[PDB]
């Protein structure tokens, strides 16, 4: 899914992290498609929350393995509880983060 | 050049350079923890620093405790990233085979250094 | 504004990224699947080779996450990567947990790599530290 | 670019850079010490250095002995302060589970690095803004 | 209960420093120094770092002395501070010039108190004592 | 303290004249001819100077003098042509092979060890290839 890698990201910002780009390509070679690429709006908002918690909370900075993987598990926990990305608060994201950590 | 500090725990003194020229200030412990032989713990220091951009905070063990009671740090050259604004914690570990280590509140467990790191840009090449 | 030449000996592994600017160093990925028993060690290959510039040194620091959680550290903890070294970077990991084995998968970021300018001093022997105290 | 070193033991050679560009000079041991599995000892290097002001001396383990027999340093990033003029010592520790380590006199135990440390001035604030 | 105002004046008079002479070193006005010494204005946590660099005493010692006030009500170290400086000058020379001390020390203040308590036991004065003799006693503590 | 013989022997190996070395070390030719003959004992700082002059690391000269106090002579100084060809190979292996750089103790000791293995199997250091000696280097470093 190399063609889909760059063109879709431009459309997110209406334009006319390289490790994150390689992780999406791992999903194409594994599951055939990319569940993250289609719902990138919810990922970017959650990745911006996971980013802030790693740099402003000791329990995250000293107990984290992969920022991308932690964002995915958090989005799967919110989808399981059927909670939306727009109506989610950064403080609420932190409480779920420490649990998985 | 200065460096900002926020005492999340006012009960512990401000870190002090003491004698000028020494590598770094020593950090105090905010918790009372006892390390069994082999075990480890993440002690909170009760302070938060704002390392300047383009530099790095480094947490080194103290030679006193390491030689005598055998107390060291798991991630021994402890990294404090420039963008980190949280409470600095130290991952101590009792390396003594069969002697418990007791850390009281206020005991200086490790020291903090600040050095200029070369923020490089990786470039892949076919063959050197 | 300095470029660190790197050759990927394992093209299956991602290039080490610095992510947010100002971060200390890029993280290195593991090319092997190794399991460390409590107390044991192993020399993990990273599948990448770097060309440290003259007057600098490459430093391999453990990651606070793995070190705090499972207790994984490096034996030569401030690992030195000399400027003249062009071989495969390896990381000598060690399981410090008394009775919990550690499993390392391929591609996992085990350690991070810092590059600092070291002062190549010239040693001079003296009878005693005169002009010093 | 100048470091002064007194040999408190004339038997051991003066530490050398060997090929230029290497991170630091290696230190020789003045004592014959055997480290039991899990034990530790403070081996003397027989040299004393005068670290220049504004720098710090760094004692790193030698990767070799560490990867092979499992010899490391307890205070692994060993700090040699600029004002310290005593004999440099290395806090060795045997990390191998059940294999004793024997260090002979003259054996290269660790290497010594000198880097520029930034002597910063701490100023307390209520909260970053 | 921050007794730092008493501690600064007592040490300022120990160092034979003039309120105006200390004023030039710290940059604080005479009145600012006066209100701090009088307790009418509490001494900030950053200000102590400057009185430490003005009096010439490491700030950590000031925290140890103020810790004596919150414990025993007074400071036994501040009362006999002349003997402490004479003993602390020795532990400092030994910490930076002796391998046995530099690689086995925890807190220079605590060991300086222990050394003065050991000399009071043997009834010898801290001024008729030699640096070599204190170093042998220092190694014994470690 | 037989360093004087060590300098003159290696000086000829580098094809350096007593005057050309005087330009690099800054010592008068009379101070050089006094040291190379043994009238004045070359001091400790001199050994570092000469070392930089003759393009030989300083610790190698201390190792050569250790052989004189042991076996009466220096086997490494006599066959120094085989040493330089052998020492050039261990250097490339130590800086370009992970299996060497992360598991080596002393390049000098391993350089002599490899020369003793070729002397036993009657292999010459000039007609030997780096690929074979790298294979042997891995052996003495394993086990």
mmCIF file with all atom_site columns, C-alpha atoms in Angstrom, chain D:
data_model
loop_
_atom_site.group_PDB
_atom_site.id
_atom_site.type_symbol
_atom_site.label_atom_id
_atom_site.label_alt_id
_atom_site.label_comp_id
_atom_site.label_asym_id
_atom_site.label_entity_id
_atom_site.label_seq_id
_atom_site.pdbx_PDB_ins_code
_atom_site.Cartn_x
_atom_site.Cartn_y
_atom_site.Cartn_z
_atom_site.occupancy
_atom_site.B_iso_or_equiv
_atom_site.pdbx_formal_charge
_atom_site.auth_seq_id
_atom_site.auth_comp_id
_atom_site.auth_asym_id
_atom_site.auth_atom_id
_atom_site.pdbx_PDB_model_num
ATOM 1   C CA . UNK D 1 1   ? 42.852 19.893  24.874 1.00 0.00 ? 1   UNK D CA 1
ATOM 2   C CA . UNK D 1 2   ? 45.321 19.236  27.715 1.00 0.00 ? 2   UNK D CA 1
ATOM 3   C CA . UNK D 1 3   ? 44.938 16.840  30.655 1.00 0.00 ? 3   UNK D CA 1
ATOM 4   C CA . UNK D 1 4   ? 47.463 16.250  33.436 1.00 0.00 ? 4   UNK D CA 1
ATOM 5   C CA . UNK D 1 5   ? 47.864 12.819  35.019 1.00 0.00 ? 5   UNK D CA 1
ATOM 6   C CA . UNK D 1 6   ? 50.098 11.625  37.861 1.00 0.00 ? 6   UNK D CA 1
ATOM 7   C CA . UNK D 1 7   ? 51.155 7.972   37.878 1.00 0.00 ? 7   UNK D CA 1
ATOM 8   C CA . UNK D 1 8   ? 50.761 6.859   41.484 1.00 0.00 ? 8   UNK D CA 1
ATOM 9   C CA . UNK D 1 9   ? 52.032 3.451   40.302 1.00 0.00 ? 9   UNK D CA 1
ATOM 10  C CA . UNK D 1 10  ? 55.161 3.526   38.090 1.00 0.00 ? 10  UNK D CA 1
ATOM 11  C CA . UNK D 1 11  ? 54.641 -0.086  37.004 1.00 0.00 ? 11  UNK D CA 1
ATOM 12  C CA . UNK D 1 12  ? 51.478 0.463   34.986 1.00 0.00 ? 12  UNK D CA 1
ATOM 13  C CA . UNK D 1 13  ? 51.887 2.339   31.687 1.00 0.00 ? 13  UNK D CA 1
ATOM 14  C CA . UNK D 1 14  ? 50.499 5.811   31.302 1.00 0.00 ? 14  UNK D CA 1
ATOM 15  C CA . UNK D 1 15  ? 47.039 5.573   29.687 1.00 0.00 ? 15  UNK D CA 1
ATOM 16  C CA . UNK D 1 16  ? 47.209 6.152   25.941 1.00 0.00 ? 16  UNK D CA 1
ATOM 17  C CA . UNK D 1 17  ? 44.743 7.036   23.191 1.00 0.00 ? 17  UNK D CA 1
ATOM 18  C CA . UNK D 1 18  ? 46.189 4.417   20.779 1.00 0.00 ? 18  UNK D CA 1
ATOM 19  C CA . UNK D 1 19  ? 44.407 5.185   17.483 1.00 0.00 ? 19  UNK D CA 1
ATOM 20  C CA . UNK D 1 20  ? 43.150 8.771   17.423 1.00 0.00 ? 20  UNK D CA 1
ATOM 21  C CA . UNK D 1 21  ? 39.410 9.436   17.525 1.00 0.00 ? 21  UNK D CA 1
ATOM 22  C CA . UNK D 1 22  ? 38.722 6.787   20.161 1.00 0.00 ? 22  UNK D CA 1
ATOM 23  C CA . UNK D 1 23  ? 36.300 7.991   22.825 1.00 0.00 ? 23  UNK D CA 1
ATOM 24  C CA . UNK D 1 24  ? 38.663 7.641   25.779 1.00 0.00 ? 24  UNK D CA 1
ATOM 25  C CA . UNK D 1 25  ? 41.886 6.147   27.077 1.00 0.00 ? 25  UNK D CA 1
ATOM 26  C CA . UNK D 1 26  ? 41.783 2.788   28.838 1.00 0.00 ? 26  UNK D CA 1
ATOM 27  C CA . UNK D 1 27  ? 42.795 2.398   32.484 1.00 0.00 ? 27  UNK D CA 1
ATOM 28  C CA . UNK D 1 28  ? 45.026 -0.382  33.789 1.00 0.00 ? 28  UNK D CA 1
ATOM 29  C CA . UNK D 1 29  ? 44.456 -2.180  37.085 1.00 0.00 ? 29  UNK D CA 1
ATOM 30  C CA . UNK D 1 30  ? 47.017 -1.950  39.884 1.00 0.00 ? 30  UNK D CA 1
ATOM 31  C CA . UNK D 1 31  ? 45.501 -4.778  41.963 1.00 0.00 ? 31  UNK D CA 1
ATOM 32  C CA . UNK D 1 32  ? 44.774 -8.465  41.450 1.00 0.00 ? 32  UNK D CA 1
ATOM 33  C CA . UNK D 1 33  ? 41.133 -8.846  42.496 1.00 0.00 ? 33  UNK D CA 1
ATOM 34  C CA . UNK D 1 34  ? 38.714 -11.741 42.017 1.00 0.00 ? 34  UNK D CA 1
ATOM 35  C CA . UNK D 1 35  ? 34.995 -10.920 41.947 1.00 0.00 ? 35  UNK D CA 1
ATOM 36  C CA . UNK D 1 36  ? 32.661 -13.680 43.078 1.00 0.00 ? 36  UNK D CA 1
ATOM 37  C CA . UNK D 1 37  ? 29.327 -13.910 41.218 1.00 0.00 ? 37  UNK D CA 1
ATOM 38  C CA . UNK D 1 38  ? 27.237 -10.950 42.362 1.00 0.00 ? 38  UNK D CA 1
ATOM 39  C CA . UNK D 1 39  ? 29.991 -9.392  44.480 1.00 0.00 ? 39  UNK D CA 1
ATOM 40  C CA . UNK D 1 40  ? 31.747 -6.108  43.724 1.00 0.00 ? 40  UNK D CA 1
ATOM 41  C CA . UNK D 1 41  ? 35.032 -4.386  44.475 1.00 0.00 ? 41  UNK D CA 1
ATOM 42  C CA . UNK D 1 42  ? 36.654 -0.968  44.094 1.00 0.00 ? 42  UNK D CA 1
ATOM 43  C CA . UNK D 1 43  ? 39.768 -1.612  42.018 1.00 0.00 ? 43  UNK D CA 1
ATOM 44  C CA . UNK D 1 44  ? 42.482 1.042   42.034 1.00 0.00 ? 44  UNK D CA 1
ATOM 45  C CA . UNK D 1 45  ? 43.794 2.334   38.710 1.00 0.00 ? 45  UNK D CA 1
ATOM 46  C CA . UNK D 1 46  ? 47.087 3.689   40.048 1.00 0.00 ? 46  UNK D CA 1
ATOM 47  C CA . UNK D 1 47  ? 46.599 7.041   38.294 1.00 0.00 ? 47  UNK D CA 1
ATOM 48  C CA . UNK D 1 48  ? 45.144 10.406  39.267 1.00 0.00 ? 48  UNK D CA 1
ATOM 49  C CA . UNK D 1 49  ? 43.925 12.993  36.767 1.00 0.00 ? 49  UNK D CA 1
ATOM 50  C CA . UNK D 1 50  ? 43.305 16.740  37.006 1.00 0.00 ? 50  UNK D CA 1
ATOM 51  C CA . UNK D 1 51  ? 40.036 17.240  35.123 1.00 0.00 ? 51  UNK D CA 1
ATOM 52  C CA . UNK D 1 52  ? 39.932 20.776  33.654 1.00 0.00 ? 52  UNK D CA 1
ATOM 53  C CA . UNK D 1 53  ? 37.276 23.165  34.894 1.00 0.00 ? 53  UNK D CA 1
ATOM 54  C CA . UNK D 1 54  ? 34.092 23.016  32.864 1.00 0.00 ? 54  UNK D CA 1
ATOM 55  C CA . UNK D 1 55  ? 34.586 19.342  31.999 1.00 0.00 ? 55  UNK D CA 1
ATOM 56  C CA . UNK D 1 56  ? 33.860 15.994  33.650 1.00 0.00 ? 56  UNK D CA 1
ATOM 57  C CA . UNK D 1 57  ? 35.739 12.701  33.705 1.00 0.00 ? 57  UNK D CA 1
ATOM 58  C CA . UNK D 1 58  ? 33.684 9.682   32.667 1.00 0.00 ? 58  UNK D CA 1
ATOM 59  C CA . UNK D 1 59  ? 34.614 6.075   33.481 1.00 0.00 ? 59  UNK D CA 1
ATOM 60  C CA . UNK D 1 60  ? 32.849 3.604   31.150 1.00 0.00 ? 60  UNK D CA 1
ATOM 61  C CA . UNK D 1 61  ? 33.083 -0.195  31.293 1.00 0.00 ? 61  UNK D CA 1
ATOM 62  C CA . UNK D 1 62  ? 34.956 -1.987  28.539 1.00 0.00 ? 62  UNK D CA 1
ATOM 63  C CA . UNK D 1 63  ? 32.387 -3.619  26.233 1.00 0.00 ? 63  UNK D CA 1
ATOM 64  C CA . UNK D 1 64  ? 34.572 -6.713  25.715 1.00 0.00 ? 64  UNK D CA 1
ATOM 65  C CA . UNK D 1 65  ? 34.832 -8.039  29.281 1.00 0.00 ? 65  UNK D CA 1
ATOM 66  C CA . UNK D 1 66  ? 31.176 -7.052  29.714 1.00 0.00 ? 66  UNK D CA 1
ATOM 67  C CA . UNK D 1 67  ? 29.895 -9.068  26.748 1.00 0.00 ? 67  UNK D CA 1
ATOM 68  C CA . UNK D 1 68  ? 32.152 -12.065 27.495 1.00 0.00 ? 68  UNK D CA 1
ATOM 69  C CA . UNK D 1 69  ? 32.532 -12.601 31.254 1.00 0.00 ? 69  UNK D CA 1
ATOM 70  C CA . UNK D 1 70  ? 29.968 -10.005 32.365 1.00 0.00 ? 70  UNK D CA 1
ATOM 71  C CA . UNK D 1 71  ? 32.084 -7.362  34.107 1.00 0.00 ? 71  UNK D CA 1
ATOM 72  C CA . UNK D 1 72  ? 30.465 -3.949  34.585 1.00 0.00 ? 72  UNK D CA 1
ATOM 73  C CA . UNK D 1 73  ? 30.643 -0.887  36.838 1.00 0.00 ? 73  UNK D CA 1
ATOM 74  C CA . UNK D 1 74  ? 28.168 -0.342  39.679 1.00 0.00 ? 74  UNK D CA 1
ATOM 75  C CA . UNK D 1 75  ? 28.168 3.442   39.230 1.00 0.00 ? 75  UNK D CA 1
ATOM 76  C CA . UNK D 1 76  ? 28.456 2.651   35.547 1.00 0.00 ? 76  UNK D CA 1
ATOM 77  C CA . UNK D 1 77  ? 28.733 6.267   34.273 1.00 0.00 ? 77  UNK D CA 1
ATOM 78  C CA . UNK D 1 78  ? 31.479 6.984   36.798 1.00 0.00 ? 78  UNK D CA 1
ATOM 79  C CA . UNK D 1 79  ? 31.980 10.701  37.407 1.00 0.00 ? 79  UNK D CA 1
ATOM 80  C CA . UNK D 1 80  ? 35.483 12.092  37.983 1.00 0.00 ? 80  UNK D CA 1
ATOM 81  C CA . UNK D 1 81  ? 34.893 15.625  39.257 1.00 0.00 ? 81  UNK D CA 1
ATOM 82  C CA . UNK D 1 82  ? 37.047 18.504  38.042 1.00 0.00 ? 82  UNK D CA 1
ATOM 83  C CA . UNK D 1 83  ? 38.221 19.203  41.595 1.00 0.00 ? 83  UNK D CA 1
ATOM 84  C CA . UNK D 1 84  ? 39.052 15.595  42.479 1.00 0.00 ? 84  UNK D CA 1
ATOM 85  C CA . UNK D 1 85  ? 42.805 14.926  42.605 1.00 0.00 ? 85  UNK D CA 1
ATOM 86  C CA . UNK D 1 86  ? 42.877 11.481  44.224 1.00 0.00 ? 86  UNK D CA 1
ATOM 87  C CA . UNK D 1 87  ? 43.563 8.072   42.751 1.00 0.00 ? 87  UNK D CA 1
ATOM 88  C CA . UNK D 1 88  ? 40.958 7.037   40.187 1.00 0.00 ? 88  UNK D CA 1
ATOM 89  C CA . UNK D 1 89  ? 39.142 3.859   41.209 1.00 0.00 ? 89  UNK D CA 1
ATOM 90  C CA . UNK D 1 90  ? 36.637 1.668   39.364 1.00 0.00 ? 90  UNK D CA 1
ATOM 91  C CA . UNK D 1 91  ? 33.632 0.068   41.082 1.00 0.00 ? 91  UNK D CA 1
ATOM 92  C CA . UNK D 1 92  ? 33.569 -3.311  39.351 1.00 0.00 ? 92  UNK D CA 1
ATOM 93  C CA . UNK D 1 93  ? 30.778 -5.863  39.762 1.00 0.00 ? 93  UNK D CA 1
ATOM 94  C CA . UNK D 1 94  ? 30.375 -9.430  38.471 1.00 0.00 ? 94  UNK D CA 1
ATOM 95  C CA . UNK D 1 95  ? 27.054 -9.674  36.632 1.00 0.00 ? 95  UNK D CA 1
ATOM 96  C CA . UNK D 1 96  ? 27.578 -13.281 35.495 1.00 0.00 ? 96  UNK D CA 1
ATOM 97  C CA . UNK D 1 97  ? 25.263 -15.565 37.509 1.00 0.00 ? 97  UNK D CA 1
ATOM 98  C CA . UNK D 1 98  ? 27.782 -18.251 38.515 1.00 0.00 ? 98  UNK D CA 1
ATOM 99  C CA . UNK D 1 99  ? 31.201 -17.575 36.979 1.00 0.00 ? 99  UNK D CA 1
ATOM 100 C CA . UNK D 1 100 ? 33.959 -15.912 39.036 1.00 0.00 ? 100 UNK D CA 1
ATOM 101 C CA . UNK D 1 101 ? 35.951 -13.094 37.440 1.00 0.00 ? 101 UNK D CA 1
ATOM 102 C CA . UNK D 1 102 ? 39.692 -12.650 38.000 1.00 0.00 ? 102 UNK D CA 1
ATOM 103 C CA . UNK D 1 103 ? 41.359 -9.315  37.203 1.00 0.00 ? 103 UNK D CA 1
ATOM 104 C CA . UNK D 1 104 ? 45.152 -9.273  37.019 1.00 0.00 ? 104 UNK D CA 1
ATOM 105 C CA . UNK D 1 105 ? 47.478 -6.313  37.411 1.00 0.00 ? 105 UNK D CA 1
ATOM 106 C CA . UNK D 1 106 ? 47.879 -4.388  34.173 1.00 0.00 ? 106 UNK D CA 1
ATOM 107 C CA . UNK D 1 107 ? 44.562 -5.616  32.778 1.00 0.00 ? 107 UNK D CA 1
ATOM 108 C CA . UNK D 1 108 ? 42.604 -2.878  31.012 1.00 0.00 ? 108 UNK D CA 1
ATOM 109 C CA . UNK D 1 109 ? 39.484 -2.570  33.173 1.00 0.00 ? 109 UNK D CA 1
ATOM 110 C CA . UNK D 1 110 ? 37.698 0.532   31.907 1.00 0.00 ? 110 UNK D CA 1
ATOM 111 C CA . UNK D 1 111 ? 38.098 3.557   29.655 1.00 0.00 ? 111 UNK D CA 1
ATOM 112 C CA . UNK D 1 112 ? 38.112 7.221   30.682 1.00 0.00 ? 112 UNK D CA 1
ATOM 113 C CA . UNK D 1 113 ? 36.189 9.904   28.784 1.00 0.00 ? 113 UNK D CA 1
ATOM 114 C CA . UNK D 1 114 ? 36.345 13.690  29.182 1.00 0.00 ? 114 UNK D CA 1
ATOM 115 C CA . UNK D 1 115 ? 33.324 15.677  27.986 1.00 0.00 ? 115 UNK D CA 1
ATOM 116 C CA . UNK D 1 116 ? 32.196 19.276  28.322 1.00 0.00 ? 116 UNK D CA 1
ATOM 117 C CA . UNK D 1 117 ? 29.460 19.457  30.959 1.00 0.00 ? 117 UNK D CA 1
ATOM 118 C CA . UNK D 1 118 ? 27.338 22.599  31.238 1.00 0.00 ? 118 UNK D CA 1
ATOM 119 C CA . UNK D 1 119 ? 27.602 24.006  34.767 1.00 0.00 ? 119 UNK D CA 1
ATOM 120 C CA . UNK D 1 120 ? 24.056 25.347  34.981 1.00 0.00 ? 120 UNK D CA 1
ATOM 121 C CA . UNK D 1 121 ? 22.514 27.602  37.635 1.00 0.00 ? 121 UNK D CA 1
ATOM 122 C CA . UNK D 1 122 ? 19.268 26.297  39.103 1.00 0.00 ? 122 UNK D CA 1
ATOM 123 C CA . UNK D 1 123 ? 16.458 28.851  39.446 1.00 0.00 ? 123 UNK D CA 1
ATOM 124 C CA . UNK D 1 124 ? 13.129 27.774  40.922 1.00 0.00 ? 124 UNK D CA 1
ATOM 125 C CA . UNK D 1 125 ? 9.822  28.807  39.344 1.00 0.00 ? 125 UNK D CA 1
ATOM 126 C CA . UNK D 1 126 ? 6.208  28.259  40.354 1.00 0.00 ? 126 UNK D CA 1
ATOM 127 C CA . UNK D 1 127 ? 5.227  26.658  37.030 1.00 0.00 ? 127 UNK D CA 1
ATOM 128 C CA . UNK D 1 128 ? 6.513  26.656  33.441 1.00 0.00 ? 128 UNK D CA 1
ATOM 129 C CA . UNK D 1 129 ? 4.643  29.116  31.226 1.00 0.00 ? 129 UNK D CA 1
#
